[PDB]
Design an enzyme around this catalytic site. Structure first.
Site, PDB file in Angstrom:
ATOM      1  N   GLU A  63       0.822  -1.194   0.000  1.00  0.00           N
ATOM      2  CA  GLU A  63       0.000   0.000   0.000  1.00  0.00           C
ATOM      3  C   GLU A  63       0.863   1.253   0.000  1.00  0.00           C
ATOM      4  O   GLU A  63       0.489   2.263  -0.585  1.00  0.00           O
ATOM      5  CB  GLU A  63      -0.947   0.025   1.201  1.00  0.00           C
ATOM      6  CG  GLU A  63      -2.046   1.070   1.033  1.00  0.00           C
ATOM      7  CD  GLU A  63      -3.218   0.854   1.955  1.00  0.00           C
ATOM      8  OE1 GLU A  63      -3.620  -0.312   2.143  1.00  0.00           O
ATOM      9  OE2 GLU A  63      -3.748   1.861   2.477  1.00  0.00           O
ATOM     10  N   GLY A  82      -6.248   5.572  -0.411  1.00  0.00           N
ATOM     11  CA  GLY A  82      -6.480   4.157  -0.645  1.00  0.00           C
ATOM     12  C   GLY A  82      -7.916   3.819  -0.314  1.00  0.00           C
ATOM     13  O   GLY A  82      -8.351   3.992   0.821  1.00  0.00           O
ATOM     14  N   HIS A  89      -1.199 -13.989  -0.026  1.00  0.00           N
ATOM     15  CA  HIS A  89       0.045 -14.426   0.580  1.00  0.00           C
ATOM     16  C   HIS A  89       0.306 -15.801  -0.011  1.00  0.00           C
ATOM     17  O   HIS A  89      -0.462 -16.736   0.203  1.00  0.00           O
ATOM     18  CB  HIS A  89      -0.110 -14.505   2.098  1.00  0.00           C
ATOM     19  CG  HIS A  89      -0.509 -13.205   2.721  1.00  0.00           C
ATOM     20  ND1 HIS A  89      -1.687 -13.044   3.415  1.00  0.00           N
ATOM     21  CD2 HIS A  89       0.100 -11.997   2.728  1.00  0.00           C
ATOM     22  CE1 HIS A  89      -1.786 -11.791   3.824  1.00  0.00           C
ATOM     23  NE2 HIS A  89      -0.714 -11.134   3.418  1.00  0.00           N
ATOM     24  N   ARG A  91       3.896 -16.955  -0.398  1.00  0.00           N
ATOM     25  CA  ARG A  91       5.187 -17.439   0.072  1.00  0.00           C
ATOM     26  C   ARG A  91       5.655 -16.692   1.314  1.00  0.00           C
ATOM     27  O   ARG A  91       5.537 -15.474   1.398  1.00  0.00           O
ATOM     28  CB  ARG A  91       6.237 -17.285  -1.034  1.00  0.00           C
ATOM     29  CG  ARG A  91       7.642 -17.732  -0.656  1.00  0.00           C
ATOM     30  CD  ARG A  91       7.960 -19.113  -1.206  1.00  0.00           C
ATOM     31  NE  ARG A  91       7.900 -19.140  -2.669  1.00  0.00           N
ATOM     32  CZ  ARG A  91       8.258 -20.181  -3.416  1.00  0.00           C
ATOM     33  NH1 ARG A  91       8.705 -21.292  -2.843  1.00  0.00           N
ATOM     34  NH2 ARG A  91       8.164 -20.115  -4.736  1.00  0.00           N
ATOM     35  N   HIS A 106      -4.655   0.554 -14.228  1.00  0.00           N
ATOM     36  CA  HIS A 106      -5.571   1.570 -14.730  1.00  0.00           C
ATOM     37  C   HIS A 106      -5.257   2.924 -14.111  1.00  0.00           C
ATOM     38  O   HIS A 106      -5.099   3.040 -12.892  1.00  0.00           O
ATOM     39  CB  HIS A 106      -7.028   1.214 -14.413  1.00  0.00           C
ATOM     40  CG  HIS A 106      -7.990   2.323 -14.707  1.00  0.00           C
ATOM     41  ND1 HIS A 106      -8.196   2.808 -15.980  1.00  0.00           N
ATOM     42  CD2 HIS A 106      -8.771   3.070 -13.890  1.00  0.00           C
ATOM     43  CE1 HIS A 106      -9.060   3.806 -15.936  1.00  0.00           C
ATOM     44  NE2 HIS A 106      -9.425   3.984 -14.677  1.00  0.00           N
ATOM     45  N   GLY A 108      -6.857   6.653 -14.106  1.00  0.00           N
ATOM     46  CA  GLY A 108      -7.939   7.527 -14.510  1.00  0.00           C
ATOM     47  C   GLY A 108      -7.870   8.908 -13.893  1.00  0.00           C
ATOM     48  O   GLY A 108      -6.954   9.211 -13.128  1.00  0.00           O
TER      49      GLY A 108
END
Lengths: 138, 138, 138, 138
Positions: A63, A82, A89, A91, A106, A108
């Site tokens: 994030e 966000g 997950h 590994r 994308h 925009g």
């Protein structure tokens, strides 16, 4: 390049000092025409009780990268938030530093979709994530 | 009661010392018949560059409560691993502490799906997330 | 070559008759070395009340391609079940047929992660999705 | 009461005629203080090849209720478009009808986040999803 703001990695890392990014030693190390990469250590501040990288730490890295990349794709007073994030997950990681590579899915005027793939020191996929952002002006 | 293992909040909190949970001062404060709650400070350790709660911080809390809850719903040598995590950030936080409430959506023999809702100190929903886990041995 | 089952496009489409895939005229049109593709019309059975493709149909298309692709990567008695699906609607479609392109992000012995892209007849991205599955015997 | 537009169930159901929802026999049956509910049959139209409810079908139901509920919380010429959808499939349905319960997690000026839970005829959770919408005015 998809970038709109001209800001160096030095400045990027500088902006993380004093907050979560600096606290976990998440560092931006590369920026290409359409990609952003940052690394994060697998240590006491990112590990679970049993020595494995905390899955939560991987999402923070994902994030963190996705949001700054999105921000770098906006201008002036515009800001990026966000809205929705998810990650798989696949590994576990136990040492060294993991590497997250972020690429756009994308871009925009009001929303963006970023894909972040995080790998262990040996190049294996540990976490794959997608972040959905909103571009706002407040 | 959904729990298959016995444990104290004291023990829970003690296990985070020296690793991620402990350094973020995330504390388990309540264990109900089918709910588990933990709080996390809103600060320099969990803030993003612009002063607000880092979206990743919220996921860290969700995955921490959801994974331990998952573990407490297993037995013996069985273990739980997080497979997928998704979250919608509905509101931001700036100070104090937020608290995650975790309840089950599905407790299967091989899989679990946990719902974790995080609220700011005023009771407002800040993040809604779901953690899917796998129950494994070895 | 990621498939473990040798089944033609003809047979895949045959299996879709009598169920949702056939009802919506979802047709598989290509099986690659590590990719699966299918198209779906934008008509009365997949449109919202205003002539645009129902966001739900794009997800039906995504999950259908991803689940069959996952299935094709297992063998014998094994089956694949969708655990988590997420999709970002970036552009709506109004006519002709849309095409879903599914590629693997992770193929494990117990879980898989697929990414399905859906474009309009003009090649513009309309929906981008991710499907997480579980490999079961049962 | 979160509603901003006045509507009737009779009108709601009439609008799906001739389009996707109408052909899947999805029926709005209850409008609460802050909830919207609709049922959908588990039959040939909503099943996958092996006889169980198509996960994509549950998403269709989720996005249908969520998008209309969102529209009902807007005014004038404002409209709602689905941005991101995510769902966790926890139980498979074989017959009868499933019913989705839509409730809000966030009702903002520019964004909405809706939670839709789908249950089987015995009241068991089958699918839990969240729809994120964007309020647009054109």
């Amino acid at each position: 390049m998809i970038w709109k703001r001209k800001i160096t990695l030095e400045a990027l890392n500088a902006m993380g000092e004093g907050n979560m990014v600096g606290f976990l030693d998440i560092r931006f190390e590369h920026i290409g025409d359409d990609t952003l990469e940052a690394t994060m250590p697998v240590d006491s501040r990112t590990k679970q009780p049993f020595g494995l990288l905390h899955g939560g730490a991987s999402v923070v890295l994902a994030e963190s990268i996705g949001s700054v990349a999105g921000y770098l794709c906006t201008e002036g007073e515009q800001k990026v938030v966000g809205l929705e994030i998810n990650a798989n997950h696949v590994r576990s990681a136990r040492e060294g530093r993991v590497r997250g590579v972020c690429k756009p899915l994308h871009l925009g005027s009001r929303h963006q979709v970023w894909q972040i793939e995080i790998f262990d020191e040996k190049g294996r996929l540990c976490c794959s994530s997608r972040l959905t952002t909103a571009i706002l002006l407040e």
